[PDB]
Ligand binder design. Structure first.
Ligand SMILES: [Mn+2]
Ligand SMILES: [Mn+2]
Ligand SMILES: [Mn+2]
Length: 316
């Protein structure tokens, strides 16, 4: 049985856009994201039958240490920047933010493991927990393709990304083979190589311009030929490497961006993760059944909690 690691914010944003906003609590507040997010857990529990499951939090969705390296990072998504230490106010619809609070309440009362690392993103939590796992195959559940950098075959246990780009129902599991087949990175280091390719090609939806003149195809063939990004910069710095002069000029005109983006684009694998629960075991019933029942009533997702309990009951 795999341990599921859930990219919480990716998922309840998906649920917010995948469940109609006319699904409301008795007090009138939309709870479409809450319903959608709980149902996704039940769907995941029934499909994967995990014993262990963690909802990974964004203690800081936009850490200033990444913004100091690449100021444009996630900048088009900031509602209001907050100074030193305080996470920036993300641009989020006014009727989704209370729903995030509802979800965290329901998880806390149920006792579903959540995890976070102060000053780090959920993606770092995901990378840390998947890097450290030594017992069970890891399924990272997310709509964020950046996480494909976590895929792993060996050393065991394997790590797959159950990718939500087309929704949960169509989601398949991505491993090094799929990543290699889809982006042209070498299979023996598909995960890390994917992150090196994303650095070079850029990622506009996160405000990372990438290296001008080096698209994804060119990035792949330079990894397919030089094996690793460190090698590409050496081949560029060494004046008679086989590198084309055009490619050298593009790479040298970007050395400081390449260096600064390295730690921005790669997820941290050694973040100080803390759990809300003593362990990452999935509980088979609510830790606080009365509060769960009260919060679900108040939040208008009683039937979703009902369906979660049935999925849990069907675990062997
Ligand atoms: Mn800030
Ligand atoms: Mn994220
Ligand atoms: Mn990204």
């Amino acid at each position: 049985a795999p341990i599921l690691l859930l990219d919480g914010a990716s998922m309840w944003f998906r649920s917010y856009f995948g469940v109609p906003s006319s699904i409301k609590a008795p007090d009138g507040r939309p709870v479409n994201a809450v319903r959608g997010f709980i149902d996704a857990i039940s769907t995941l529990v029934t499909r994967e039958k995990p014993r262990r499951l963690v909802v990974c939090r964004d203690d800081d969705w936009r850490p200033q240490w990444r913004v100091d390296l690449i100021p444009s990072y996630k900048a088009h998504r900031v509602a209001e920047p907050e100074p030193d230490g305080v996470p920036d106010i993300e641009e989020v619809p006014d009727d989704l933010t209370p729903q995030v609070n509802m979800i965290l309440e329901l998880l806390d009362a149920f006792g579903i493991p959540t995890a976070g690392a102060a000053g780090f993103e959920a993606n770092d939590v995901l990378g840390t927990l998947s890097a450290r796992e030594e017992r069970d195959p890891v399924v990272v559940v997310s709509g964020d393709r950046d996480l494909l950098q976590l895929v792993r075959d060996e050393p065991a246990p394997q790590v797959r990304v159950l990718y939500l780009g087309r929704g949960l129902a169509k989601a398949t599991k991505w491993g090094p083979a799929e990543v290699a087949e889809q982006y042209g990175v070498p299979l023996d280091r598909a995960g890390t190589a994917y992150a090196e390719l994303a650095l070079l090609r850029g990622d506009p939806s996160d405000g990372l311009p990438g290296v001008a003149g080096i698209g994804e195809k060119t990035a792949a063939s330079l990894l397919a030929k030089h094996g690793s990004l460190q090698n590409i910069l050496d081949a560029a710095h060494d004046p008679k490497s086989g590198l084309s002069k055009a490619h050298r000029t593009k790479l040298l005109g970007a050395v400081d961006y390449i260096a600064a983006a390295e730690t921005v684009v790669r997820v941290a694998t050694d973040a100080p993760v803390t759990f809300s629960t003593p362990t990452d075991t999935l509980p088979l019933a609510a830790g606080d059944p009365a509060r769960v029942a009260e919060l679900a009533a108040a939040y208008g997702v009683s039937s979703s909690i009902s369906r979660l309990q049935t999925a849990l009951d069907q675990l062997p």
